[PDB]
Amino acid sequence: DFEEIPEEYL
Amino acid sequence: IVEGSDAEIGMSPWQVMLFRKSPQELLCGASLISDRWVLTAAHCLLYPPWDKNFTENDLLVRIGKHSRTRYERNIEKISMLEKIYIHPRYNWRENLDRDIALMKLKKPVAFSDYIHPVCLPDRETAASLLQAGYKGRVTGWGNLKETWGQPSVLQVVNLPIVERPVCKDSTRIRITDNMFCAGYKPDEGKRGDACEGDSGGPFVMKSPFNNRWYQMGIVSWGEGCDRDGKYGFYTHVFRLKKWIQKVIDQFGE
Amino acid sequence: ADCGLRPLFEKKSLEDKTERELLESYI
Ligand SMILES: *P(=O)(O)[C@@H](CCCOC)NC(=O)[C@@H]1CCCN1C(=O)[C@H](NC(=O)OCc1ccccc1)C(c1ccccc1)c1ccccc1
Numbered sequence: 499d500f501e502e503i504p505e506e507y508l
Numbered sequence: 509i510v511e512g513s514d515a516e517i518g519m520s521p522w523q524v525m526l527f528r529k530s531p532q533e534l535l536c537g538a539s540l541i542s543d544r545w546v547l548t549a550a551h552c553l554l555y556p557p558w559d560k561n562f563t564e565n566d567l568l569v570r571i572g573k574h575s576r577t578r579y580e581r582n583i584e585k586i587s588m589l590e591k592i593y594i595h596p597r598y599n600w601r602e603n604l605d606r607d608i609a610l611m612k613l614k615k616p617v618a619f620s621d622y623i624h625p626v627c628l629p630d631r632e633t634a635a636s637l638l639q640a641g642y643k644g645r646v647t648g649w650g651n652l653k654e655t656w657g658q659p660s661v662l663q664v665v666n667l668p669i670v671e672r673p674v675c676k677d678s679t680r681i682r683i684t685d686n687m688f689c690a691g692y693k694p695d696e697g698k699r700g701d702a703c704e705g706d707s708g709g710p711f712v713m714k715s716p717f718n719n720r721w722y723q724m725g726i727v728s729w730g731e732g733c734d735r736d737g738k739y740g741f742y743t744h745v746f747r748l749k750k751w752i753q754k755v756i757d758q759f760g761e
Numbered sequence: 762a763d764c765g766l767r768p769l770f771e772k773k774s775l776e777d778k779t780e781r782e783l784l785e786s787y788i
Contacts, residue, residue, distance in 0.1 A: 499577055503532075503579050519767070620768070627765035642786050722765060
């Protein structure tokens with residue numbers, strides 16, 4: 499349900 | 509937030525979402541109190557009865573948000589945690605007394621139209637504003653109902669602080685001086701409460717003396733959401749300010 | 762410092778739609 503966030507943050 | 513409304517854009521620029529990395533989900537609210545410190549409820553990070561015990565690496569802080577679920581490109585800022593600090597006398601075993609924690613960010617967040625710190629109360633602030641009948645404001649992306657929906661956008665609700673005897677008579681939980689309760693009574697005909705997922709977010713008031721917003725409370729607990737004759741309970745930020753001061757001057761910005 | 766003063770409201774002297782409810786409850 500949550501939109502993907504840039505992988506720089508993960 | 510049950511029975512609130514959609515926030516306006518930039519209405520609560522200190523609002524912070526605590527976001528779990530995996531699975532990707534909302535963990536709690538939180539607030540921005542400087543460019544490197546974030547305030548939340550201890551039980552968002554540590555709560556043994558639910559097997560919750562997050563480490564720094566398990567979460568992210570999302571600041572400047574409005575939509576709950578969307579990645580707000582060029583508006584929100586996503587920050588990593590350097591270190592979590594829980595109150596050493598947080599009481600998770602019984603009543604969530606001292607339900608407060610700080611999180612230091614790895615890097616300073618830049619302020620913008622959407623990202624700005626809230627003030628913390630001093631003794632006079634608390635004495636003058638924390639009175640029964642004075643209203644504060646609670647904000648969060650938690651559930652819209654005790655049981656069902658979920659919001660699209662940040663929600664807001666204004667609620668009056670409740671007399672201490674009325675708080676105490678509403679609950680079987682032991683209430684301490686580190687807590688206060690807020691919400692309308694049945695006879696008042698207005699509603700609103702925090703609900704699951706709103707914990708850790710701020711209860712704020714706008715001083716009529718200096719026109720600044722102060723964070724008087726932290727969403728801590730409640731017996732269901734928006735039930736008649738129950739009230740939400742908030743950590744009393746001014747009572748725990750010495751602890752806040754001590755961790756920031758020992759470790760921070 | 763500048764804490765508690767919102768860029769889109771207090772800094773531009775604009776009020777949000779329910780802050781008046783708060784200020785009417787203060788005394
Ligand atoms: P947060 O994690 O978003 C926030 C929820 C506040 C909004 O109202 C529920 N905090 C809590 O959920 C805390 C965390 C430990 C449980 N706790 C509670 O508030 C207990 N509330 C309760 O179980 O209500 C049932 C419920 C809650 C949400 C949605 C559906 C149903 C609370 C309590 C439990 C039992 C009797 C009275 C109060 C409590 C307080 C202090 C220690 C333990 C449990």
